[PDB]
Amino acid sequence: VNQNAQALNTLVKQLSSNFGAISSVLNDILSRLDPPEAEVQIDRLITGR
Amino acid sequence: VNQNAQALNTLVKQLSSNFGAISSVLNDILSRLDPPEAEVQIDRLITGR
Amino acid sequence: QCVNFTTRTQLPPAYTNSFTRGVYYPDKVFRSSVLHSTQDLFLPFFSNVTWFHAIHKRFANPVLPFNDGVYFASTEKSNIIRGWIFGTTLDSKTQSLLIVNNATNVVIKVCEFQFCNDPFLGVYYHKNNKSWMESEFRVYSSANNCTFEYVSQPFLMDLEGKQGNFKNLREFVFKNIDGYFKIYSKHTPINLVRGLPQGFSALEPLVDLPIGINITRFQTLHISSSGWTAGAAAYYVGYLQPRTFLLKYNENGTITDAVDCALDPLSETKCTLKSFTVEKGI
Amino acid sequence: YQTSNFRVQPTESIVRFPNITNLCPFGEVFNATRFASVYAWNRKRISNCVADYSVLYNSASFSTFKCYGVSPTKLNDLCFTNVYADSFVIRGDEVRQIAPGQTGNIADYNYKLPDDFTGCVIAWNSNNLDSKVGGNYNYLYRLFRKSNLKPFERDISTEIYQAGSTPCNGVKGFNCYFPLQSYGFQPTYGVGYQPYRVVVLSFELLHAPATVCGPKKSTNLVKNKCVNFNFNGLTGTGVLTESNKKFLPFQQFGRDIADTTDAVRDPQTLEILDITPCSFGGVSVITPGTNTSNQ
């Protein structure tokens, strides 16, 4: 049970890491840059997640 | 038998995915861009496959 | 001419049922005996479309938005509908797109059109050697300041009157993606008394027009002053929405079945497993 | 032990396209007397794969070359459907505003290139031709508009509309202004105010047939072997056989479940050829121990 809890906790906590982007929240990146410069950073989030 | 059949159908769908590139079929990419500009789309295809 | 009909009444946008309508070839790739799931601007199955008709002292020709995409379906014996009026302001103020199919070719002109209050044409003294040829053109007296002109290829359409069951069906899909006009067309014979026939069919593309003008509204012209009337005709107006269909291609490449993913919860399972047979389960 | 993968290499190369009807006007439109404004741009649809290989000004003949993908010299083996020549005149500092999906004054308010644009952006210095004494008021530009324009959308309206946040109800007045403006081109100042006629070529890749390819035409067909074929711009290696595949008259080629080339049609005559890759497989080596025998 502790190993399952630690696995789920790691799985959620990994969402806060930036993975090479400016920030971890997708709404701040989609709310600032235009879509053509934006596809490289979302693709970096996609490959990492 | 269904899991083995379903596994090969997974490979066919992966062959059809674009993986963030211009087109999922490689022959239009090798036949269009020169090798230095083409290497950007090819590294995406190799790591994804 | 200036005043309208005393019996003219605007009907409300009544709704009817549309079953298998709205399935077309989404792209130009040919495929055989596979199941492809695509995303494009579509007409949802089992949706509500406007219900209009004409019978033997009511004429309704309103203005509707072209915004989210449209679907036109006309069931007519003598092919009353020649074409449509496209544009933002739909008048001489701004540019307006006019497409006309005269049963020879498809005439496309963008000009400044002086608008007559009652557009129509006429055929007089048909008693001997009918032939249904065009006689007088009363819609527009003059045209100028033309920014675009196009003439399409010669086509085949039968304007001759017939007897018996409905001999013609015209199915057209009109949409604009990033300034690219995508026109889809289907013509098939049916056996029908009243209503819509039970069946399934797919629509083929017609022309690709790189015009690129913003069109927020559209109009319909009817061609068959108080003594003149409009004949019996029917047309349907659908609304396109960006949905996802699962298409079933047969051995000949035609679309023999279509499953809308978000339509029903059984079809949600059909779209998750990518098959037309869903094994039992949650 | 598994070592290498045996593969049959293609012996020959078959590139098959019909006879040349006519040739595209690339330099005839370059010699035109005058172009339209930035918002009024003239478009000419002239199809097929190959325009003209004899006269090519694409190499260091003009003022400014900003290209994407490949240059016109490398376009001879690539077959495309539509060719749209767009003509408009800009100034020197607005060359930087032409690029797919990027903003700007002329990008947002006049014309922005779509993300599907594969062509080259061609500019030429008109100061020895289009320039006039005291400024050229013939060309126009729309500096202000009520809303942003999507890629490939044209607004030719020259009338007086809302400029700022307060509508003035048509005719000029009530602290509004006339949206359209004109260029001030003067021959004696620097590059930023120098006119550049911009001709851009927008490409769309579809399945429609091209009737003209290269100086060579027939290259007689050889079937039942793996060869390098280029048909409508698709280069691959496979066996050309006849099949029962039924294609619609306007559909040139099909694809399989792997989203790869399945069957193609002859652009020259009426035929349907199925592409089946030539047989290959692995090589297994049955050998004893090194201390026993080398067989």
Place this chain on the structure above:
Amino acid sequence: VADYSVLYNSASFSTFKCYGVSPTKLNDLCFTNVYADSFVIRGDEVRQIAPGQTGNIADYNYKLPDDFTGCVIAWNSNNLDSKVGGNYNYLYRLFRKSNLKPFERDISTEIYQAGSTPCNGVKGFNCYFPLQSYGFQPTYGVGYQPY
């Protein structure tokens, strides 16, 4: 709740190059403080300005932050601030030991290290004077015009 009663922002000046959303659409967005900034660069340094990008003025003098959604308002000062023989009033650092991060500035005009060997302040010891001045000539092109 920036003052909407008095608005001079509509076509009162020479030219408007805007990005993102207009001041008219800022009513649907919520900001705390709004600073109106004013500065002068040359014509050649206009093209080096791009959102979150590199350049000669970007990694050396000042780089604009990634958060700017507003309009860039400009007026033509070439007939006022520019002078014959160069304008020595404004100063700039053309060279710096390292590239700047986004939204970072160094305004110091004093004498510092030029090359790879520090000369310890005041000019000498086979170093050169880091600071440079504008060479603005009214008879040349757009690149030398103040904006």
Place this chain on the structure above:
Amino acid sequence: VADYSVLYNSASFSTFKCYGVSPTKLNDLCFTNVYADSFVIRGDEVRQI
């Protein structure tokens, strides 16, 4: 191999002027060939070069 330290860092000459490259960047930079053009001119003709 040419030693530019006694030619520059020693400050034994009257003056020097550089074009396109800093005098301190020549230690980590260099090109394929180096030439030396020797000629005698007057003082008023130094600015003409």
